[PDB]
A paper describes a structure:
Segmented negative strand RNA viruses of the arena-, bunya- and orthomyxovirus families uniquely carry out viral mRNA transcription by the cap-snatching mechanism. This involves cleavage of host mRNAs close to their capped 5′ end by an endonuclease (EN) domain located in the N-terminal region of the viral polymerase. The sNSV cap-snatching ENs belong to the PD-D/ExK superfamily of cation dependent nucleases. We find two different kinds of endonucleases, one with the characteristic catalytic histidine (His+) as in orthomyxovirus and bunyavirus, which have efficient endonuclease activity in isolation, and a second, without the histidine (His-) and conserved among arenaviruses which shows very poor activity in vitro.
To demonstrate the presence of a cap-snatching endonuclease domain in hantavirus L proteins we determine the crystal structure of the isolated Hantaan virus EN in complex with Mn2+ ions and characterize its endonuclease activity. We could express and purify protein constructs comprising residues 1–179 and 1–182 that crystallized with 2 mM MnCl2 as thick plates diffracting to 1.7 Å resolution. The structure was solved by SAD experiment. Each protein binds two Mn2+ ions in the active site in a similar fashion to that observed for LACV and influenza. A third Mn2+ stabilises the interface between crystallographic symmetry related neighbour proteins. Overall, Hantaan EN conserves the two lobe shape of LACV but with the active site, which lies between the two lobes, being more accessible. The active site of Hantaan EN structure is configured very similarly to that of LACV and IAV ENs with two divalent cations bound in a canonical way. Mn1 is octahedrally coordinated by the side chains of amino acid residues H36, D97 (from the conserved PD motif) and E110, and the main chain carboxyl oxygen of V111. Mn2 is coordinated by D97 and E54 coming from the conserved flexible loop preceding helix αc. The Hantaan EN efficiency for single stranded RNA appears similar to IAV and LACV but it is able to cleave structured RNA more efficiently than either IAV or LACV, probably due to the higher accessibility to the active site.
Author numbering: 0 to 179
The structure:
């Protein structure tokens, strides 16, 4: 990965007169990981995601899925139970998971992570999104039971974890993992 860049660097000669540094290499690896993330994200966008261009705010996805604007407003003041920082839905609705797909009142989210440690990367993304999305589902269902929306919603969160090295990817669905 960096072998290639070590060789290129050493051919720069007068235009890079210092030996390649560790800090440089770490930055360059980070740039490569960011591109890997974006390519895999584009792959999902090509033939899965409703959002073909960019990531979308959760509040906006709810609107696209038919949640009335007054319901979204009502939800904003609520605090997510068991959120690691006590985040409100007003803040949570601004967050932008990579991909979503709406099938009626089922809303699926897929977050891409590129990580050296798949288990860690999955845990990090779940910690970010999962309590909030679960809570949204619970609260929407209450509105349905009260007759204020005609159907409840199902909200799922999935993580696609792409290894930094090699072509192996781990998919975490809500109830199971598949390494690949
Ligand atoms: Mn140099
Ligand atoms: Mn993103
Ligand atoms: Mn991502």
């Amino acid at each position: 990965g960096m072998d290639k860049y070590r060789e290129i660097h050493n051919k720069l000669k007068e235009f890079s007169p210092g030996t390649l540094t560790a800090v440089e290499c770490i930055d360059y690896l980070d740039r490569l990981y960011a591109v890997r993330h974006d390519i895999v994200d584009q792959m999902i966008k090509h033939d899965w995601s409703d959002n073909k261009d960019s990531e979308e705010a959760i509040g906006k996805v709810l609107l696209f899925a038919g949640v009335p604007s007054n319901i979204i407003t009502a939800l904003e003041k609520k605090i997510i139970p068991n959120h690691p920082t006590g985040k409100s839905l007003k803040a949570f609705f601004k967050m932008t998971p990579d991909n979503y797909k709406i099938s009626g009142t089922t809303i699926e989210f897929v977050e891409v992570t590129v990580t050296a440690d798949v288990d860690k990367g999955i845990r990090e993304k779940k910690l970010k999104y999962e309590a909030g999305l679960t809570y949204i589902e619970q609260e929407l269902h209450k509105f349905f039971l009260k007759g204020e929306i005609p159907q409840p919603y199902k909200i799922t969160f999935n993580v696609v974890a792409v290894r930094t090295d090699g072509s192996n990817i781990t998919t975490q669905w809500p109830s199971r993992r598949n390494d690949g």
